[PDB]
Amino acid sequence: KETAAAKFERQHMDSSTSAASSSNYCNQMMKSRNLTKDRCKPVNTFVHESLADVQAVCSQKNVACKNGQTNCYQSYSTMSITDCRETGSSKYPNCAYKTTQANKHIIVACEGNPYVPVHFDASV
Template sequence: MVEKEVLIENPWYSSLLLLLVLTLLGLGLVQPSYGQDRMYQRFIRQHVDPQVTGGNDNYCNVMMQRRKMTSYQCKRFNTFIHEDIWNIRSICSTTNIQCKNDEMNCHEGVVKVTDCREIGNSKPPNCRYRARASTRRVVIACEGSPEVPVHFDR
């Protein structure tokens, strides 16, 4: 018990802890704020699948359901990015461009994707999709410090 109290009260220990926190901040390893983190996690759930290089119709049908985009209604269109999250995050460091909502926090990059478009008259949770795999330019909105992707714009 005495050893723990001595360790916490030791100024060297406090300095080391402060240095560690500042180092993590500097390296960008600290998570974004709660709201941005929630939006970042949602972006990953809805748009990131690095394990695949391109999908077919069955891929879209399975992934849209697995990623919970068909529970209450069929999401009409969704894009899965087939890149490592660090490659996607690096898009946030490119030049800012205008988003569809006129904000200036969008960035563009070229990535491998599968676009999933709903086939008319499908019903949740068994929504049906047509897939189109390609390598193309995408635009994502980024926020935070460090900036992380929070919205797939186009």
Template sequence: DLLGPFPLLLVLLGSWGPVHPLGAWAQPQTRAQWFAIQHISTGPVQCNMAMRRVNNYNQRCKPQNTFLHDTFQNVAATCLLPNRTCRNGQNNCHQSANIIGMTYCSHTGGTYPNCRYSTTPQNQFYTVACNPPQPGDPPYPLVPVHLD
């Protein structure tokens, strides 16, 4: 037996299947989870740092993004306010009851993964599109899925 235990080792290694990059295991499963990653930050952000997490999912520099300085729970409560028409014509949008702090990020240069952004603090109302929760979402009547 020239190879000793090596044929068994090769069989075991070959049965593992394809190797996935680390980010592939952490993909958000629902639109609400993706909304939280893209748009929720409980405080002000520095865009060059904050956008890394957003950009890692699609492996590109997102041209612009807004982070709401609030909790997911509070933004989900906005979904219970009166409906209004979204920019795409659908009627599942809701405007916040109050002005909140937010950070607007705009891509200024660089290519993925070295994207560079300007950081602009803002205070204003926001509008979100909401849908019923999917399995894995918090048990709210409606959850935010898009920042309009």
């Protein structure tokens, strides 16, 4: 089955664009990445950086995750991110999202060997 590392890439990485280019970005990406297959996922964040730069966060500032776990890491630098939030008109299977561009530090949970991101915790 898909590994947690692979799932992170699928759900969160978009190295192909520098930023969201239109209001439809979230709608398009949430669908293409299979995030809306079973239900509309309510919130999601895409990171517009190289995968290596995001993997490197696992060796950056150790911080407690929102749930209290201690395997979270905060990036030293801000990153280009897109926030996707379900709109009032969203109705499965026609999931609808608002796209918001931001530049923020990211917080991820890391696991394994190699030690890589497996969960997106927050943007600060």
